[PDB]
């Protein structure tokens, strides 16, 4: 069941925007003869020393090492180039191309989506609602870097002493955008373990996470300090991390840095950091997903459509050995 | 006489600005992804159909046939 429903969903997603919708980037080598910033990474392109690639078709200006990290097709990157040259409206237009492609695909090849529904034995209404889901996985998901982020503050090592105890009572704040959260406090320790997780939302790969370590002062001094400084808990150090260094899941330790007028700093902080730009990483190796698809389709054709009779395919050449089915089913598996 | 004075003058011109003063154009191929006009001929650069060359060092945007 699990694989069958997973493959149903991945077949619906695979064919609602068939990969045959996509366009290739015609890159020229282009010298950034003035300091320029890559439309993928926003990183420096400069002189012959750091040349870029300029697409013609997508127009798009990037590192060589970025011209492939520019992930979306030449329609979509012609749109994103147009937004980075000036016309943002092109992006909404090619979101509407993505919509129109999927509407045309549905309206012109409804039998693909119906056959996936029948082969996977799903109902027409529930197929319409999982189709809302995979439409949304390419139509809400038409241009998105709306990352949920899940920052486990794990531990620190070698922290500066600041305490009422003579050690520290280290806790941590995490911040992403304007939003700010904290760990509880490890008390009397310069090598603390928290393992404490903060969910955040980021909408921009050029954002930063900020992570800051604080000695928890709950005393008349901190009650006075709260009237003059925001950070009433003697600061033990920070790390700051670009959202584009993040992907999927991470578990990393970072040396600590100063901030406030009260700063004396040493050591490092370990952060686990998940980032839910992550999707179907749950792939059965796509072999197995294809097999599930193929077996379901084969039984459906031979048994369900053909009452156990093997209809020999809408096949071509000796390469009938590669055309297992009629167009609709063949295009499904292909 | 004629050649001697001609060559005197052309030697003076050749070496007052010695050709060893000069710098080479580091051209990249560059798509004029919008209608653009060549810094040599002012002629149309457009799309993949009429690509240009953009130098980095001289920066300069031109036809290939103009670079």
UniProtKB/Swiss-Prot annotation, chain A:
Expressed in brain, with highest levels in the olfactory bulb, striatum, cerebral cortex, hippocampus and cerebellum. Also expressed in pancreatic islet cells. Ca(2+) 1 binds at residues 163, 169, 215, 217. Zn(2+) 2 binds at residues 55, 58, 74. Ca(2+) 2 binds at residues 163, 215, 217, 234. Zn(2+) 1 binds at residues 38, 41, 66. Residues 130-254 form the C2 domain. It is found in: Cytoplasm; Cell membrane; Presynaptic cell membrane; Presynaptic active zone. A zinc finger (Phorbol-ester/DAG-type) spans 24-74. Belongs to the unc-13 family. Plays a role in vesicle maturation during exocytosis as a target of the diacylglycerol second messenger pathway. Involved in neurotransmitter release by acting in synaptic vesicle priming prior to vesicle fusion and participates in the activity-dependent refilling of readily releasable vesicle pool (RRP). Essential for synaptic vesicle maturation in most excitatory/glutamatergic but not inhibitory/GABA-mediated synapses. Facilitates neuronal dense core vesicles fusion as well as controls the location and efficiency of their synaptic release. Interacts with the N-termini of STX1A and/or STX1B1 and DOC2A. Interacts with BSN. Interacts with RIMS1 which recruits UNC13A to the active zone. Forms homodimers via its first C2 domain. Also interacts via this domain with the zinc finger domain of RIMS2. Part of a complex consisting of ERC2, RIMS1 and UNC13A. Also part of a complex consisting of UNC13A, RIMS2 and RAB3A. Interacts with FBXO45 (via SRY domain); leading to the degradation of UNC13A by the proteasome. This is Protein unc-13 homolog A. It comes from Rattus norvegicus.
